Symmetry: D4
Subunit: 121 residues, 8 copies
């Protein structure tokens, strides 16, 4: 099953990071969420109730990205994956990519980050 629902380049201003200075000033966090979902019924029916509403997913990611500051991106992606898998049974697996395009790293790069994939149990 290769069907997917996606949310690309979501951007939030948060204060996560292991450095005290990071939490103080904050930065923009870029988030890409890809959900494995069989979309054939919805495609057949055209009923919004037969699929996962992207809007609601964005609200979950948002609440975690703009909520309490944590240290790791790993911790933020793990809470999002877990939160999405938990509320949606139709989501067979959730992929979360977080990117810090501007971390406190002296250098020239497009960004640094992590990506996790979590199957829904």
């Amino acid at each position: 099953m290769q069907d997917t629902i996606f949310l690309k380049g979501m951007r939030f201003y948060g204060y996560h990071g292991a450095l005290s200075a990071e939490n103080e000033i904050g930065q923009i966090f870029k988030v890409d969420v890809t959900l494995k979902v069989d979309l054939s019924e919805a495609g057949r029916t055209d009923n919004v109730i037969d699929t996962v509403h992207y809007g609601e997913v964005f609200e979950e990611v948002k609440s975690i990205m703009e909520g309490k500051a944590v240290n790791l991106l790993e911790h933020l992606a793990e809470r999002i994956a877990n939160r999405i898998n938990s509320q949606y049974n139709r989501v067979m697996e959730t992929k979360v990519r977080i990117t810090k395009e501007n971390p406190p790293i002296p250098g020239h790069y497009d960004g640094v980050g992590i990506e996790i994939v979590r199957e829904n149990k």
Copy 2:
């Protein structure tokens, strides 16, 4: 067989969407279509008749993207995949990606969408 014929970033202004306001105002829908097709005969012959004409594919996608407004992107991709698989036997499988770069979602993101893959029966 990893050969493919593709159409990237096709953009149409349509009125699909589950919200009444969406159907009223409309928006730009971005479409990426990838077709699995063995292209060796055409490569050998160089005869357009031994492959699938991208132009005709664009006309099919267009007619569905710029036709009657539906609710789901899932419904639009399912009609395109089905329409392409139906008229072309050389297409072993069709992948359709639809993206709403500007849905009625209060936030900063690059876009939201769905992607389906349908083998030709």
Copy 3:
């Protein structure tokens, strides 16, 4: 005097617009603000108190872009220009550009908008 302080591509999700559907769904408004300010004293001193703090300017634009929905972009730029000119005497003139990259216009374009320039009296 060609010195300037600038804020480019500020983006806010608002509900302005003359169409009822626009106010309901909303959209992203892009804002560019350029302030005419003699920056030589600050350049000499290096004291933040001798110039206009970009951060405070962004907060003013924000409060107007994310506040009460109005009809025109002209009305929004006029309130921003007026608000910035009012609180800052060092700003000799304010330029405000607002862009609706995705208005309810059936077509392919990068965006539509207005730009105003207002001298501080």
Copy 4:
């Protein structure tokens, strides 16, 4: 008076061009329209009737860009400028930029074009 109303990167598929092959196949024409208009009343009032409606302007450009094929870009910009100046008295002057990002020129470039500025008489 430095106030302006703008429409950027409008794109149309037309068949203009002095070469027979051009008219046959066609291409994408990119259009940027900038109108000189005093926007202070509209900014004060917030009434759409006190300014020029971008939407209507796009419809005029469109009708000329997607209508009868002509030879020159100069001819197309002259008809647009003239058409906009004619219907709108509030437009003190009209600037039209047309770009052929892909003309029949053997080479590597971003595009070629012309730009005209026409005051409203």
Copy 5:
């Protein structure tokens, strides 16, 4: 073995295409070539003689893209893949992607094309 040598976004102005008007006027063809090559010896030695010289590959693609006009992109990719596989034994498999970002198709899209993968026999 996941090692690869690549050449991205190569662009040539050619006259291929099944339409007489296309051959007359011509267009820009974008080419991406990815070669499967075990790069461990070269990585160990650092001797250019233990790998495939990207420059020579570009010259082969070029000679085919800027040579005799053909009808299909399939024919052009098949000659490139075949030409590269033929001269290089270290290339276990060749992937060729050709893109016509501006074909004679009335519409708005980023491009159309084909991609082939050919193992070296």
Copy 6:
């Protein structure tokens, strides 16, 4: 008179430069040419003979950018401006911008260059 004919982002691979290593290896030179030309007659007539043919201009720039290697960008822009002003009487003034996006300068920048403006005598 604010009318102009333009050619943007023309790119050529040349060997100019004051460093021996530069002339040996070469690089990509980006060229932007803007010509001051009254385009009203052409706009009225639609006759290609009443304006300057962009294509011919590109051929002149090309012949100078891809010809004998010189030291300065200043020398290359001066020959182009002079060459265009010389063959076209309708060109009241010529602006030439040359950019070396990748010169032998150890650093991170988008490019370096020069721009000259030459009135036609």
Copy 7:
């Protein structure tokens, strides 16, 4: 005299800024430098000695952008303008633009900055 020598998008990682957290972590500073210089002799002669060497200019900007941390961007641009005007008599006037694409401002924008123009006395 409209001739200019330019250096665009120079990027340096520095620790300037009025906030203690800024100086601690640092950020990327983008710099655009435009010099007014009559380039006709150099264009005529083609001798590097008749113009200002972009490379040397980049070294001056660099030494100031990557040196001692200051509070204002105004202070950094004033030292660069002054430093360039001081060593080059051929530079009639210097324009310096500094941009903080990622300042400690909670929001979505492309960047904030200042621009100064300083004539050489």
Copy 8:
């Protein structure tokens, strides 16, 4: 296990290359590093000590990209992969992509390069 830690578009100015002129002048090398690392413990704990610190990885890549000039990109990627695998046991496999967007190749392309994948033994 599909979890990954990444560093994209790292850019360094180095002097590697098999051509004497290349080593003399130098160029910008773009580097993308993707590390296979199980990120579940870190996601659970949120302790930086349970994952690989991107910053330290960037310092290793940097020291190799900005150190002694070598001939091949293959040699540079092999030293980075080996260096990262060596210091981090949590990294199950390392992928290194190096790109020379501007090599001494007469032509128009986005870049050329190599990519290697090395499992940690």
